[PDB]
Amino acid sequence: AGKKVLIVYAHQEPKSFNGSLKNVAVDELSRQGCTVTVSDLYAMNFEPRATDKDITGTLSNPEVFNYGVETHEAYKQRSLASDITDEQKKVREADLVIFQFPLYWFSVPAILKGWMDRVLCQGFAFDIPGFYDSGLLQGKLALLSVTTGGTAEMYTKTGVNGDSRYFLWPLQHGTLHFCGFKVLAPQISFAPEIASEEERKGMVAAWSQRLQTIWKEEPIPCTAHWHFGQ
Amino acid sequence: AGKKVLIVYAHQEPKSFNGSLKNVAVDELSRQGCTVTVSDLYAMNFEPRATDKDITGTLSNPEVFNYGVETHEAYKQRSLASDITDEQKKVREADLVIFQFPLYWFSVPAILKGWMDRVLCQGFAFDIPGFYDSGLLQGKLALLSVTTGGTAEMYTKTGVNGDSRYFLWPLQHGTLHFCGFKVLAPQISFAPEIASEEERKGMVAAWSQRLQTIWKEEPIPCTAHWHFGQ
Numbered sequence: 001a002g003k004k005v006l007i008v009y010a011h012q013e014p015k016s017f018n019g020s021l022k023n024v025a026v027d028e029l030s031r032q033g034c035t036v037t038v039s040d041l042y043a044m045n046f047e048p049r050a051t052d053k054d055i056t057g058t059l060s061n062p063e064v065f066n067y068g069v070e071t072h073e074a075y076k077q078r079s080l081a082s083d084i085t086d087e088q089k090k091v092r093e094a095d096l097v098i099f100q101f102p103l104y105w106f107s108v109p110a111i112l113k114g115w116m117d118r119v120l121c122q123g124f125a126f127d128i129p130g131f132y133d134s135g136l137l138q139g140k141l142a143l144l145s146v147t148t149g150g151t152a153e154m155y156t157k158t159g160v161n162g163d164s165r166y167f168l169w170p171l172q173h174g175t176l177h178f179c180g181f182k183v184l185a186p187q188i189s190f191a192p193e194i195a196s197e198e199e200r201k202g203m204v205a206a207w208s209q210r211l212q213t214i215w216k217e218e219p220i221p222c223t224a225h226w227h228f229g230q
Numbered sequence: 231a232g233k234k235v236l237i238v239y240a241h242q243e244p245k246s247f248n249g250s251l252k253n254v255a256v257d258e259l260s261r262q263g264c265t266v267t268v269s270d271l272y273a274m275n276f277e278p279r280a281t282d283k284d285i286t287g288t289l290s291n292p293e294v295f296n297y298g299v300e301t302h303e304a305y306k307q308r309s310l311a312s313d314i315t316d317e318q319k320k321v322r323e324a325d326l327v328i329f330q331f332p333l334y335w336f337s338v339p340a341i342l343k344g345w346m347d348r349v350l351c352q353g354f355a356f357d358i359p360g361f362y363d364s365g366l367l368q369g370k371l372a373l374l375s376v377t378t379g380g381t382a383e384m385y386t387k388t389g390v391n392g393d394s395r396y397f398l399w400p401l402q403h404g405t406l407h408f409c410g411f412k413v414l415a416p417q418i419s420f421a422p423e424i425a426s427e428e429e430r431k432g433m434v435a436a437w438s439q440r441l442q443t444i445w446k447e448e449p450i451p452c453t454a455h456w457h458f459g460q
């Protein structure tokens with residue numbers, strides 16, 4: 001049984017350092033005989049706003065719109081915007097989903113928040129009950145590959161930004177873990193623009209080297225204790 | 231003299247609990263004689279994607295598009311999209327910026343993440359000389375007013391979601407403190423959709439009640455020990 005990789009990619013510039021780590025994951029994965037699919041949100045002009053256009057049928061309650069309620073209802077009736085349902089097809093068949101993005105404001109760029117807000121609806125990705133260890137996308141792995149402007153040092157418990165695990169919490173636990181993904185260790189490439197030309201190639205190389213053995217890696221424990229300590 | 235208030239609002243429905251907390255704030259700040267302005271991002275169809283369309287005229291480097299560099303440059307040359315400089319106008323004049331939003335995936339809805347990404351550009355909200363306490367929006371207060379699906383208990387230090395202070399970290403410190411804002415204690419309305427009609431009536435009353443005394447409040451210490459420590 002061959003492996004399936006979905007990369008959700010969020011950068012404007014294919015020549016960018018994020019474009020490079022994306023190309024090198026497609027390369028290393030393609031080589032190993034993985035089936036690969038890239039969601040290039042910018043190039044697709046992916047829609048980020050969560051609005052009533054996301055739904056094709058009669059609304060449940062047409063006079064007071066409620067996104068959570070209508071999308072969950074639309075999922076069940078098979079009436080989501082096809083752009084959503086296309087993403088959900090990619091996620092359903094992926095064994096692994098890689099997120100490739102530059103950190104914006106300690107988080108994901110809005111276009112990518114949009115993908116998460118819109119793709120991971122109730123009924124598809126989780127249910128109540130049916131979240132955390134019981135989320136609907138259980139059996140799947142996720143990994144964030146994040147580029148930052150801050151250095152390794154800025155990102156320590158003692159530096160100006162606090163530890164890097166601090167900002168991972170909403171993404172890794174609050175989103176991915178909530179939906180049933182197991183989460184591999186993140187790939188964080190610090191300050192590529194401040195790095196020298198060779199340290200840059202090294203960071204890219206270290207990501208290729210890492211992917212050669214990714215089917216062997218085990219999931220982080222995705223808990224408060226991993227992220228925060230005490 | 232006189233105080234100015236920008237409210238950044240992100241919900242799709244006026245009859246919503248967020249809309250009600252928004253109307254309440256406008257009425258009560260208005261009553262104290264504040265200058266009030268509302269950005270209703272959904273009603274404005276606010277653009278969340280950070281693209282090259284954000285810079286008017288010709289780009290500083292056509293070739294390789296760096297969002298960061300082009301917007302910094304375009305801030306100086308006074309050629310950013312009017313939608314952005316309009317928001318920059320409103321933030322400039324404001325003394326308190328209140329964000330009103332439903333929590334989406336331990337963070338702000340994407341449309342609101344687009345406002346931060348695009349409005350809070352280098353040269354306007356921060357520079358290298360000028361971040362955290364030196365941020366370029368120093369002077370100003372910020373308050374996150376957020377609603378949730380999860381109960382207050384789900385958001386304790388040992389509940390399934392972890393403490394609510396953990397998800398505030400990228401917003402309050404990573405974004406607002408970074409830009410120089412002093413941060414007021416967040417208003418968190420837990421689970422209004424679970425809460426009874428009277429609990430709801432009381433969370434609106436607490437909020438108007440808080441709005442009558444806001445200018446007396448001391449800002450939080452926006453530190454790691456506040457967010458994660460004990």
Ligand SMILES: Cc1cc2nc3c(=O)[nH]c(=O)nc-3n(C[C@H](O)[C@H](O)[C@H](O)COP(=O)(O)OP(=O)(O)OC[C@H]3O[C@@H](n4cnc5c(N)ncnc54)[C@H](O)[C@@H]3O)c2cc1C
Nearest residue numbers: 016017018020102103104105106147148149150200201298
């Ligand atoms: C709106 C916004 C919010 C932000 N918030 C934060 C924040 O909260 N925290 C933080 O730390 N940062 C933040 N940043 C900074 C941002 O995360 C970094 O600018 C980004 O991660 C760098 O990634 P890049 O892909 O843009 O690098 P690039 O801009 O592409 O730069 C890397 C350089 O390396 C070169 N390069 C590309 N590929 C290779 C390769 N194969 N080998 C050698 N060289 C190569 C390119 O020519 C390029 O000039 C923010 C930025 C913006 C715009």
Ligand SMILES: Cc1cc2nc3c(=O)[nH]c(=O)nc-3n(C[C@H](O)[C@H](O)[C@H](O)COP(=O)(O)OP(=O)(O)OC[C@H]3O[C@@H](n4cnc5c(N)ncnc54)[C@H](O)[C@@H]3O)c2cc1C
Nearest residue numbers: 068117246247248250332333334335336377378379380430
């Ligand atoms: C994409 C997405 C991601 C999400 N991620 C998270 C998450 O990560 N964590 C989490 O906890 N939740 C999450 N949620 C849930 C979400 O945060 C809540 O559903 C939302 O906060 C409820 O706020 P609301 O304004 O939309 O409520 P509303 O649905 O409008 O409900 C409030 C209730 O009060 C009523 N009401 C309106 N005005 C008043 C008033 N004047 N006085 C009394 N009652 C009034 C309404 O009729 C309604 O009955 C997510 C939701 C979505 C859609």
Ligand SMILES: Cc1c(COc2ccc([N+](=O)[O-])cc2)c2c(n1C)C(=O)C=C(NCCCCN)C2=O
Nearest residue numbers: 149150151193194298301346347348349350351352
């Ligand atoms: C260490 C850190 C950085 C470092 O960023 C940079 C900036 C420029 C270059 N360059 O041109 O070579 C390299 C790194 C940055 C941030 N933080 C914490 C940040 O928080 C926001 C940035 N840019 C934000 C622009 C936002 C609104 N449009 C940013 O560059």
Ligand SMILES: Cc1c(COc2ccc([N+](=O)[O-])cc2)c2c(n1C)C(=O)C=C(NCCCCN)C2=O
Nearest residue numbers: 067068071117118120121122335379380381423424
């Ligand atoms: C504790 C928690 C909740 C609680 O949800 C709710 C919402 C409403 C009611 N109600 O009125 O009876 C009860 C529980 C929710 C989430 N989390 C952590 C979440 O992450 C996403 C939700 N809704 C998303 C719907 C999918 C749209 N893309 C959600 O309701």
Ligand SMILES: [Zn+2]
Nearest residue numbers: 173177222223
């Ligand atoms: Zn977790």
Ligand SMILES: [Zn+2]
Nearest residue numbers: 403407452453
């Ligand atoms: Zn802080």
